[PDB]
Write a structure and sequence with these properties.
The protein has about 475 residues and is an alpha/beta fold. Helix content is about 15%, strand content about 20%. Bound molecules: calcium ion (CA) (8 copies) and zinc ion.
Length: about 475
């Protein structure tokens, strides 16, 4: 009968489900693509210049008011005044460049620094009198006089935009408004709308800050919890949306990249500096052997390397995701009791201290449970074919367990394992080998009864029959 260990894997594999025919939060559930289509509903976009291979947009920081500032009412009907104008401070400029970069990392856009003034295709400036919210931008389908502008509220009472920094609202607002200048709309409001909306007014359930920085709804609405932090860079649905517009950037991080601790992506939102770090990011990577290093956290974590899946990293829930079309290969857990689930390719999963549950999935994985009593789960024989078997690089009999309880053959077929020394031609025969010389163990099982192993598991440590769970 299925074990608790296998149950935890199955549960997390289906956590944060999207696209179900069901009504989630009284709203239809959209897939990543349906969501992208919704975010792009206005059909606004920049046109790539003649002879340019990539869309090239320059940006500049306004030094004095422009036409729209002086005469807002000539463009936006109900804006009589914007208060006092002020230029972007040094911090706002540095942070604005990091947000711009986070967009160019995922699409084919090359941002050029036009400096101080009104010469850039995208301009940034501050205003002091709110017209409703804390900032605003114009999509690229407006007359040339307005195209590319984004404005941010700064005054004695509202200070969120004064010091943008990794993880805070000020930084997300920059990323959000720039999104607008690039062509992205809020995930909702167009068919109708009002003055005081709530998440109840969302078009689809995944319109929350866990899937799109363009949303205004808390991630809690969908089950995630970033504990006060805000994503500084584009999230799962934003990447998909911006990519339909300007294509996927296939030149980004093509080397062997590490995300989290010991990061080599010179990006603040992909790096963890201490155990107290609150990470919130969606991985976009175009190539190489990559690792999600979450070694520094002591909390119980759940990591899923499948694309489009979210993980509960460092104390937060559903804070780490992997974009569509991305293959991350390895993951390293921390000292807490973790759940690491791999994807279709060969993965290196390291549970570290604590009692972990490792699920390699398809491909020949290298599973390391590390200190503690770890469980290595399997739910399909093809996950460790005899042709391309897994390798348990640090098995410890009487401590670690190999979990086979969720296989169909056992849970439905009622197959019983008979430990033989040679395949005779009966289904259910298993040979537990072990060369004391190399200290290399082995487990082969013939499910089809044709005297040939269908499922195999290499080992480096001793595996007794009392270690295998069915
Ligand atoms: Ca890479
Ligand atoms: Ca990769
Ligand atoms: Ca661990
Ligand atoms: Ca795998
Ligand atoms: Ca462990
Ligand atoms: Ca162990
Ligand atoms: Ca496998
Ligand atoms: Ca066979
Ligand atoms: Zn907005």
């Amino acid at each position: 009968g299925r074990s608790d260990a296998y149950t935890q894997v199955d549960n997390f594999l289906h956590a944060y489900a999207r696209g179900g025919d069901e009504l989630v939060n009284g709203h239809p559930s959209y897939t990543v693509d349906q969501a992208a289509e919704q975010i792009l509903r206005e059909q606004a976009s920049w046109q790539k210049a003649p002879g340019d291979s990539v869309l090239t947009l320059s940006y500049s920081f306004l030094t004095k008011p422009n036409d729209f500032f002086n005469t807002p009412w000539k463009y936006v009907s109900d804006i009589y005044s914007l208060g006092k104008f002020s230029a972007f401070s040094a911090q706002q400029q540095a942070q604005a460049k990091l947000s711009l970069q986070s967009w160019s990392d995922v699409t084919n856009i090359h941002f050029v620094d036009a400096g101080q003034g009104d010469q850039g295709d995208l301009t940034f400036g501050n205003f002091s009198s709110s017209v409703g919210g804390a900032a605003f931008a114009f999509l690229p389908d407006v007359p040339d006089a307005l195209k590319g502008q984004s404005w941010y509220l700064i005054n004695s009472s509202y200070s969120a935009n004064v010091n943008p920094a990794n993880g805070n609202y000020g930084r997300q607002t920059l990323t959000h408004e720039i999104g607008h200048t690039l062509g992205l709309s809020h995930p909702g409001d167009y068919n109708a709308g009002e003055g005081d909306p709530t998440y109840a007014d969302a078009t689809y359930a995944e319109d929350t800050r866990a899937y799109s920085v363009m949303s205004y709804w808390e991630e809690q609405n969908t089950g995630q919890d970033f504990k006060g932090a805000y994503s500084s860079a584009p999230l799962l649905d934003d990447i998909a949306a911006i990519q339909k517009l300007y294509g996927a950037n296939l030149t980004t991080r093509t080397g062997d990249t590490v995300y989290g601790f010991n990061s080599n992506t010179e990006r603040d939102f992909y790096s963890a500096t201490s155990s107290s770090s609150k990470l919130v990011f969606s991985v976009w990577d175009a190539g190489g052997n990559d690792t999600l290093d979450f070694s520094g956290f002591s909390q119980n974590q759940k990591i899923n390397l499948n694309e489009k899946a979210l993980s509960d990293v460092g104390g937060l829930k559903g804070n780490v995701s992997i974009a569509a079309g991305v293959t991350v290969e390895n993951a390293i857990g921390g000292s807490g009791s973790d759940l690491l689930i791999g994807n279709d390719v060969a993965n290196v999963l390291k549970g570290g201290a604590g009692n972990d549950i490792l699920y390699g999935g398809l491909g020949a994985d290298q599973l390391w449970g590390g200190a503690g009593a770890d469980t290595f789960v399997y739910g399909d024989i093809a996950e460790s074919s005899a042709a391309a078997p897994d390798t348990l690089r640090d098995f410890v009999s009487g401590q670690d367990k190999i979990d086979l309880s969720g296989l169909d053959a056992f849970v439905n077929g009622g197959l019983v394992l008979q430990y033989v020394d040679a395949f005779a031609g009966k289904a259910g025969q298993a040979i537990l080998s072990y060369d004391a010389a190399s200290k290399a163990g082995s487990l082969a099982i013939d499910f089809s009864g044709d005297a040939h192993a269908d499922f195999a598991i290499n080992l480096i440590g001793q595996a007794t029959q009392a270690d295998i769970v069915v």
